[model samples]
Target: MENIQKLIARYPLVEDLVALKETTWFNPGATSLAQGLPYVGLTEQDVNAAHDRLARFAPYLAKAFPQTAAAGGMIESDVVAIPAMQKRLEKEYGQTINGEMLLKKDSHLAISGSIKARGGIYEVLTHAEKLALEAGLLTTDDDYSVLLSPEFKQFFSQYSIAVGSTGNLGLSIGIMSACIGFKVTVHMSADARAWKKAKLRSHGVTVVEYEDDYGVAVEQGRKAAQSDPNCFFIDDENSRTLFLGYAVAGQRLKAQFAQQGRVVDASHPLFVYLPCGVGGGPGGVAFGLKLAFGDNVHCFFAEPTHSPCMLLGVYTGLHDAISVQDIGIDNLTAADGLAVGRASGFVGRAMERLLDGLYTLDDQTMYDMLGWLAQEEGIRLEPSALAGMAGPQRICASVAYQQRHGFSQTQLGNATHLVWATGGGMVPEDEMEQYLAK
Candidate 1:
């Protein structure tokens, strides 16, 4: 709590009376026509609104959360941006090398394994606290419930719940809820991963696996929460609070750039290569940066070649294309975080207006990039985390990208790009050891 007051002061949540009503959009139209379809269109007004809400909830978030330790130090709060590690690399590498290798020095690893922790922890805490205050249950100890998905179970356990979802967000919610002494109920598909399920059970969380698919399981979770007034369904995909929570990362990044006497402008574009899942994080961060820098910075959406919601959505003008039950490679990817089929309506529309471009990367590229990151930059990242790095690599090698985007060797040379290595290596040490042994 040493810097708690300073932190709160720096990121003071906006009150309604002082909040601005302007929406901010970044790079309205900059990509190739094929890649230029508007996906999410947020303006400065929308970002101001989100800032107002976040400011309103700041005090509660500060009270309920503990700092995270990841890189070599402890993050004063979960809302992290480019850390010292990345800055050091930026100084050493000088920004002309392959982006993939450069991200090995990303600063996010110092907080949690991923940047999601910033949004996940803050949103969960703020939302839960808000609910508590609303119900006059704002006491020293209160039990609530959270839900999560399977892939994110381990992370949740360390951060939030002892018992939670067999699904991704469910697991995250469950773990965070438990950390704050909230009861958790996680709903999982019958096909839930065994390791994830076992981890949730070990944390003493109640787990429910539906006979049908994940969608059905989510419905069951909703019903279950309805029966219990204390239960809060912290769904990752549909929650406005969740996306708003992620905006803090962008704000923090912008602040860091300021500290270095650099303003995030179009000349020094901050190309955030984020994994496109439901498009919440990328959309939220992009929206925030737009608020800070206006049209100066360009955000690039990075998705798995297998599951390209943002990329495909930008192309087809059909925001719901990925939402369909089955879409070819757009429906599958090694990055489970990007496996989401549909984009959030608000987030999708916001990106359609704010984003500069969209790009996709294959599994092989992600894997190879991961290795290069470990070897060169010494950062151990998950395949999805490398999606951002792989994007620039793909673009660098593409003839069309070169010709159409004016991405020449010299332009690339003069750029000081920023890629969000969204997450770190989630694989167990032994598993990583085996893979490395190979």
Candidate 2:
């Protein structure tokens, strides 16, 4: 109580945060991409490696999931223009947004819908590949599709994988690990959706339910995996492998823009808004974007007002040392996938210098946008996926932020605002209907 009071006194923003009011904090310490690179300890080489690894697994992925055949076994999403949604926002909010609004449909990603499909599945695949190579059952030059054989499944059955998540990450890890014949366990937090748990079990992945929040679930999952010699724990908070896996999105997006003939330069800037939980997904993606686009790309993270963990951590320079609960904010929201209390210290510290800003939104806004996307764009997304929808509005409204960043009117007009739809494609129709009804 005393600490909470002191924090409120020290940072007046804490009071608004604790009250669960929508807020924004532009990072004054934002630096050039070159200056921020050292803090990340990852480079384009790491992202390239991750991209190559994905290619190696593409044949196997295509074989396992026919949905990926069109993508040539690669796990990726499309960038679509959302002009109607943009117009609706302008009409409703009374703010004229400059430039085009595009949606990055990671929500429809294959195997495990959501942004978690990138990092979570990548980490599991890396582990599986490592085990196979070490056991002399696989070679880099060999066709990866052979992993679909029964013998390889039997070999992989000797090992186990574990991860703790609010929902989407668990789905990715569970489905990917189990499909490879590894005994997989997903420790799910209280906020995790029942449908996600049921889906994991249907995949033959063990679902361990926890009454506590994300942090406790992770600790318990780590402890359980530590007791076994053959079990590998996927650490969401501090996994460099997971980070690099997501970073691959950056270079891919650059190519995508090139193919579309979209110019991203000094006068034609790009702005990306990512919905953040524990921070690994957005941090890695932002890192990759910085490496690919340099200073021309501006990235921001959006969080639920009820669980503004990343914003709180970055604002106070506390990283993961502080939780939303510590400052009297309940870490609860309709955005189940983003119900984390503490941000990842590794990600928070590394990306702090690179991220342009962080913002908070109430859950109702997410639902409103969720319904609007379905109505205007004929696209359905989960509530959490809508968190980034309002980002451009917030940025445009902040005249001081534009001045501080030296964003000229012409540059703003030429900007491309991409709202990352992190998950929803695989949602059961009934579940999606419920979300829509909200």
Give the winner by lDDT.
Answer: 2
**Scored by CA lDDT, what does every candidate get?**
0.52, 0.91
**lDDT, candidate 2, 358-412, per-residue tens:** 9999988999899999999999999999999999999888888889989866668
Steric clash pairs (candidate 2): 107-423
Error of 2 at 378 (Å): 0.5
Candidate 2 residue-wise lDDT at 341: 97
How many collisions per candidate? 39, 1
Evaluated with TM-score, which candidate comes out highest?
2
Residue 396 in candidate 2, Cα distance off native in Å: 0.9
**Can you give the TM-score per candidate against the true fold?**
0.69, 0.97
Off-target runs (Cα >4 Å) in candidate 1 are 1-112, 137-168, 189-194, 210-217, 321-325, 329-332, 397-409, 425-427, 434-438
Ten-residue segment with the worst summed lDDT in candidate 2? Answer: 4-13
